[PDB]
Amino acid sequence: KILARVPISVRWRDMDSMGHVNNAKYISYLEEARVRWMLGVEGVAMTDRIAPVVAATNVNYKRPLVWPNDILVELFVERLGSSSVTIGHRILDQKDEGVLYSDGNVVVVWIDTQTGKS
Amino acid sequence: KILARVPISVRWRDMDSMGHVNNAKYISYLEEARVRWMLGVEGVAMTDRIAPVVAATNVNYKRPLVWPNDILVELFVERLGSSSVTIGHRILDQKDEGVLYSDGNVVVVWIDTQTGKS
Amino acid sequence: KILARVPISVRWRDMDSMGHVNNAKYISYLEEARVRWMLGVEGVAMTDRIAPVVAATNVNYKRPLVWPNDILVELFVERLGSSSVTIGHRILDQKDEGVLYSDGNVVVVWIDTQTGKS
Amino acid sequence: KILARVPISVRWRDMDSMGHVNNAKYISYLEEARVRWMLGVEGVAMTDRIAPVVAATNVNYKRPLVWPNDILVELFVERLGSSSVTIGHRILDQKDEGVLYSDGNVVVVWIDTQTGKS
């Protein structure tokens, strides 16, 4: 199920005028986790042709996140398609993983032209 | 149905290393449209107590957006709840509104403590 | 003297938790003005080889900027070197150009390898 | 001399379409270092009245920074004024501190009304 559990440091600039991390930054935390994940395996990462592109981001905001609380981004496989993968997520507080800031998923497809993974 | 059709200028910095506007920036375009919308009506805008908070952002990425193509963010009421409002959207190209960069919705609730709108 | 006077829309997300546009966003406003400027002249813009790179950004913050006040970015030639150009700037309020949010300059050089413009 | 040496993780989104971390993000790295610094000492941080505001950011870009190379932000006192402090900086590569991405300084003043620190 689990793909990765990536610790991400929150930045002061991540917050907006309302005093909490901006909604848009959540999509960025999920992005960092995905690429830091594909970076693990082995060696240097950069590639072309049959590649992944995000088709949709579905993010639920459960409770406000404030600096300086760093997070833990948990990624797992929610759905496995022939050409797509729906990566579910849980953004938790590093100091108390029982604190859930957000869940939802991101749908990834390998296309950038026409579908392809089968 | 329609709540607003807000023109938004894209910035060069909006793009990422892959050469297209970053997914996270889409949530920001939707945000700007919502507040520029609440700004129209009349007078200066800033308020407290029974207030709106985004519960979820569901954004579908249809085709890549590249600078310097400015957009038009169309917002409409997809669902009207007792305490929430699901604002549907269509991010179109200003020069050709037949070009759809993204659709989906954002769920807004008036709480920030406990639900309230009824 | 004057190179360009570019109107730039401020975004709500531009502000930080302190309630004013973040310092880092100023460098971005200057960036947008520079590229929107090189975009004017004629036709589509994208190029390689002898190209410009920013060597330094020297930005003075005069007074706080708050949404929804859009700005006017005035760019001019402060210094002309053999291989560099120091572009001075004045970020003013669109509704009252007597309101100065920031001045200073950005030093641009055509290198990205070794200096070259002579 | 030294005020702090703060490790900062670079994010993929930090890069722009040109394939290197955007100039504006450097000001943000310097910002994070300053607040993470004021956070060390002791206890929870948030304060009002005689407070610090950035009067100027003078950043020199020495060599391009690319993800996933995390950095080390070194802050030191370049100048001590009666009401201001000019914090010099050196943004280095975490894996090789001999790699200098940027230097320069940030001028901080305690005002937000009228000068005061004497």
From TrEMBL, chains A, B, C, D:
Top-level division of the source organism's lineage: Bacteria
MF GO annotations: fatty acyl-CoA hydrolase activity
InterPro entries: 4-hydroxybenzoyl-CoA_TE, HotDog_dom_sf
A Pfam entry, by short name: 4HBT_2
Entry protein name: Thioesterase
Biological source species: Xanthomonas campestris pv. campestris (strain ATCC 33913 / DSM 3586 / NCPPB 528 / LMG 568 / P 25)
Upper classification of the organism: Bacteria, Pseudomonadati, Pseudomonadota, Gammaproteobacteria, Lysobacterales
